[PDB]
């Protein structure tokens, strides 16, 4: 037998042998644009971190309500992020709990009308403004003294629903003693949280620090998960950052938190590599080894053709 063709293949002995019609197995092209997964339409956090979304950054109000999604797309060095400098405790654990939740539901727990002897509207800062005017996160309340008094807070919540909740609160790390006196009457302060599995006690820290975002102060937040028929108990004497909105869980599935800077275009994609949509039937790909959904395996070699013919 003999024919004419211009393919090549690599064997154990030689590396530049030319062969007849072969069958390529590695897929190298891609769409290069983020699209929708199986009809379900993704969530694009344009310039916003996960902490900024879950806390309610003033310049992130485009995501106050979001339908069902498939994955969370994020951008490196996100400008907005968090404003009043601080930290989220176990922040990497929270982002591991995500990519397992596909649907959320914002629910109103103890409202702005449940604080009679506590001011709730004069808490703002220049670190997070809105159209010039100062502002503050929207899923969390900063409590300040009112008529020269900060009475002790004793509140509780019973999860009557058949779903679980994610509650976020915080503490204020004042800079000096004069600042703490100005905000809250009591110098020595603490916060206690008690559940059926949790036990926490904390106190503020006063010291001298540097200037970041023009603010000489810090904040620290914390998170937990509640259970049906369970209860959560809050108690504090000062430096309390009370919550207003909670988060429900109604669906659990497969997701992925990526980091990319590609634009959004209308499609219907099946496997979404971080840098471009891919749709093919070959059993090997080469683009990027962090995929969502079903799609072939990842190899590094630049040529995986396997011969089928003779000569």
């Amino acid at each position, epitope marked *: 037998h003999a024919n004419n063709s211009t393919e090549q293949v690599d064997t154990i002995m030689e590396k530049n042998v030319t062969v007849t019609h072969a069958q390529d197995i590695l897929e190298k092209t891609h769409n290069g644009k983020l699209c929708d997964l199986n009809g379900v339409k993704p969530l694009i956090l344009k310039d916003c971190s996960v902490a900024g979304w879950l806390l309610g950054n003033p310049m992130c*109000d*485009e995501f106050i309500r*979001v*339908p069902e999604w498939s994955y969370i797309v994020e951008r490196a060095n996100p400008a907005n992020d968090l404003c009043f400098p601080g930290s989220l405790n176990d922040y990497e654990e929270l982002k591991h709990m995500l990519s397992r939740i596909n649907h959320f539901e914002k629910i109103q727990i103890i409202p702005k009308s449940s604080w009679p002897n506590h001011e709730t509207s004069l808490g703002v800062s220049a670190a997070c403004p809105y*159209q010039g005017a100062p502002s503050f996160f929207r899923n969390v309340v900063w409590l300040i003294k009112k008529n020269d008094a900060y009475p002790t807070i004793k509140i509780s919540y019973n999860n009557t629903n058949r779903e679980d909740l994610l509650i976020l609160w915080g503490i204020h790390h004042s800079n000096n003693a004069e600042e703490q006196t100005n905000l809250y009457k009591n110098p020595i302060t603490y916060i206690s949280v008690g559940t059926s599995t949790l036990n926490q006690r904390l106190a503020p820290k006063i010291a001298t620090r540097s200037q970041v975002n023009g603010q000489r102060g810090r904040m620290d937040f914390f998170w937990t998960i509640l259970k049906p028929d369970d209860a959560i108990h809050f108690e504090s004497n000062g430096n309390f950052i009370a919550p207003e909105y909670a988060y429900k869980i109604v669906k659990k599935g497969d997701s992925t938190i990526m980091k990319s800077g590609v634009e959004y275009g209308h499609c219907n994609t099946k496997c979404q590599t971080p840098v471009g949509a891919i749709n093919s039937s070959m059993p090997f790909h080469n683009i990027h080894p962090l995929t969502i959904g079903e799609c072939p395996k990842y190899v590094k070699s630049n040529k995986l053709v396997l011969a089928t013919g003779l000569r």
Partner: antibody
Framework: VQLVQSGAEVKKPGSSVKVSCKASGGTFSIYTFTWVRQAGLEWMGGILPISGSAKYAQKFLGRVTITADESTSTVYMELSSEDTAIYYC??????????????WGQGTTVT | EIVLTQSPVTLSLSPGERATLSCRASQSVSRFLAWYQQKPGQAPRLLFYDASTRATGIPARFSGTGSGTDFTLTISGLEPEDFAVYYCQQRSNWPPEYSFGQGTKLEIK
């Protein structure tokens, strides 16, 4: 969430009428409300109640005044002279994407 | 600002055939439009949305596709209840901005 408006009234032209957009049955504080008039269809703008602002219509950018109260589920409008007809209300869900004004009102006539 | 012009307002028809509408675009609006159907004496009803797909309660008789610069609404078989005025809508920017069309009439012969 069911929507019912104020009613009807007749006043001299050039004055203002406060038409309401009362609703009930959910979390009102994160919903988008607009205004549609019929003196085809026209638009004025509304308010997201959690932000405390408004996006007035460029056709009459200084005409209307819109405000919302997040303790009673009611939206106001201040129309401060051929306006002799009805004014509706509407609602579209979600923020980052647009589906459509699913829940529509019934009407309010002012002559 | 965005301006929209629809198909000619007067369009008489008789049952037993199809009807299709149109609505211009001007500057691009992508896929953020909505449809409607207003009968005399009440508020309209969302027929199709996402400038393409349909919702619940709308009969399968109604259809219509086109997002980029074409806008259509095609019926399979004319029924005696398909008689009203239909309109066009869009939305722009993050802070909600809107604008409506003029309207079209389908009338019996």
């Amino acid at each position: 969430v069911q929507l019912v408006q104020s009613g009807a009234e007749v006043k001299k032209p050039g004055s203002s009428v406060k038409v309401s957009c009362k609703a009930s049955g959910g979390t009102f504080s994160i919903y988008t409300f607009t205004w549609v008039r019929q003196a085809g269809l026209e638009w004025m703008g509304g308010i997201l109640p959690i932000s405390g602002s408004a996006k007035y219509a460029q056709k009459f950018l200084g005409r209307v005044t819109i405000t919302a109260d997040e303790s009673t589920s009611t939206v106001y409008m201040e129309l401060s002279s051929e306006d002799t007809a009805i004014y509706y209300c509407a609602r579209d869900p979600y923020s980052n994407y647009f589906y459509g004004l699913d829940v529509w009102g019934q009407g309010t006539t002012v002559t | 600002e965005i301006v929209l012009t629809q198909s000619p307002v007067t369009l008489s028809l008789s049952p037993g055939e199809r009807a299709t509408l149109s609505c211009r675009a001007s500057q691009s609006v992508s896929r953020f439009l909505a449809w409607y159907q207003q009968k005399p004496g009440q508020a309209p009803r969302l027929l199709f949305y996402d400038a393409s797909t349909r919702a619940t309660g709308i009969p399968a008789r109604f259809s219509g596709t086109g997002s980029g610069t074409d806008f259509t609404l095609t019926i399979s078989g004319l029924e005696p209840e398909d008689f009203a005025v239909y309109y066009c809508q869009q939305r722009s920017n993050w802070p909600p901005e809107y604008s409506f069309g003029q309207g079209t009439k389908l009338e019996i012969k």
